[PDB]
């Protein structure tokens, strides 16, 4: 069982907590208030027992309460079959794909998050707040802010997929990490417009830590380098050129 | 189900509607198959069942998906398992697929196009931001069917063919303010259309445009505020 388990916040209260691997890939995203847990876009059949075992070190998939979800994801099928069956949580997901998911077939287990977002209460009494991040890329779109660590969980935005070679916890440079999240952000986030709007959003709330679904997580000076970067990404239909 | 209606026909080409609501189109030239949007894993046994009352399963050479979807991965086994067809798709999903890359074909964004025994071709259309980042339809150049995927679809969040326009519009009105990116993306796609030329838009659920009703929905879309027009509503 190759997997590492990295404590990002912690106050007797409250974790939050990474779970990765290496050949350092990050698998999943875990918060535990008092002793209940939320899972951050699980996702994965190819790591889900070795998920499970991540997270049995610091809670019994017994105590999962809720789950989350950034966006519709073509994932599974195959995945929230296995999360919906160990735990016996809350799905919280954009309304846009409420309806759709049945194809989680039983609708009483999701919660539809509204577009401008909400709050979800915790048991110490702290908040996680659903940050609105529609069109980058998908129409219905979120991130989960937790507020006690003051850690926005970003989904894909800031995201290196493709790759997975980051060596450390946390971006050290970004303009060496630039090339590992361009590319992604270029094509699929939908316009300037947005992002822009997105960014100023998320300046308002002052995140210490941005942390994408994949790759290395933003902290410190690095927080305002991506955000700086992002707000003036030409991105998606500004290159409606290269679309038809 | 299940009832198969023949869009068109013409002794080397078909398009076929299978349903129970829309389940599945088939396009059948000379003796080979082509799947649009077949999709579902809980619908898989239902769709083979439909298929093998027009053709062998055997004999489907391609099959199409018009965007990334929950139901288009792990349905993607199964349909490399029972035939040996190419499975189109747009490169931004090829990508991801290590999750048999051989039969993949992955589309580029501007589009491609596929050969048919006929000699026709059907030409992969570019949807993007429709609200999927990489999207595609499906013209028939054959028939002048334009498989629209989600664009033009009663996804409900009942004619075989629209027959009243403004009827129809509440089933459709909700999905494509919310869910298509911009009237920018919109309104080009609608001119990219236009030059196809097309006498029907099929879209993956509700009732098929024609005649009139092609150029009524058409019109509509190319002039519709949608997605981050409203930016107000989105935080």
Redesign the interface.
Same mark, same amino acid.
């Given at each position: 069982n190759g997997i590492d388990g990295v404590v990002l916040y912690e106050d007797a209260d409250h974790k939050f907590i990474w779970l990765g691997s290496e050949s350092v890939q990050t698998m999943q995203y875990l918060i535990v208030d008092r002793g209940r847990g939320v899972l951050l876009d699980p996702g994965?059949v190819?790591l889900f027992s070795r998920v499970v075992t991540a997270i049995s070190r610091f809670i019994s998939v017994d105590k999962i309460d809720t789950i989350f979800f950034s966006h519709?994801?073509?994932?599974? @099928?195959?995945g929230i079959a296995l999360w919906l069956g160990i735990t016996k949580a809350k799905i919280y997901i954009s309304s846009?794909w409420v309806?759709?998911m049945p194809?989680i077939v039983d609708i009483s287990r999701m919660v539809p998050i509204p577009?401008?977002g909400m709050s979800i209460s915790l048991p110490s009494g702290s908040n996680m707040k659903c940050i609105?991040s529609?069109?980058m890329?998908?129409?219905?779109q979120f991130g989960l802010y937790d507020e006690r660590s003051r850690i926005l969980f970003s989904g894909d935005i800031g995201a290196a997929?493709?790759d997975d070679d980051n060596e450390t916890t946390f971006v050290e440079d970004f303009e060496k990490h630039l090339p590992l999240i361009e590319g992604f952000h270029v094509?699929?986030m939908? @316009?300037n417009?947005?992002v822009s709007?997105?960014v100023e959003?998320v300046r308002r709330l002052n995140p210490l830590m941005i942390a994408p679904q994949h790759g290395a997580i933003y902290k410190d000076e690095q927080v305002n380098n991506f955000l700086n970067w992002l707000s003036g990404l030409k991105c998606?239909?500004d290159y409606?050129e290269?679309?038809?």
């Open positions: 994965g190819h519709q994801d073509p994932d599974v @099928s195959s846009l309806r759709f194809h577009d401008k609105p529609h069109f890329h998908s129409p219905g997929v493709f094509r699929y939908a @316009s417009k947005i709007k997105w959003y998606g239909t409606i290269n679309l038809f």
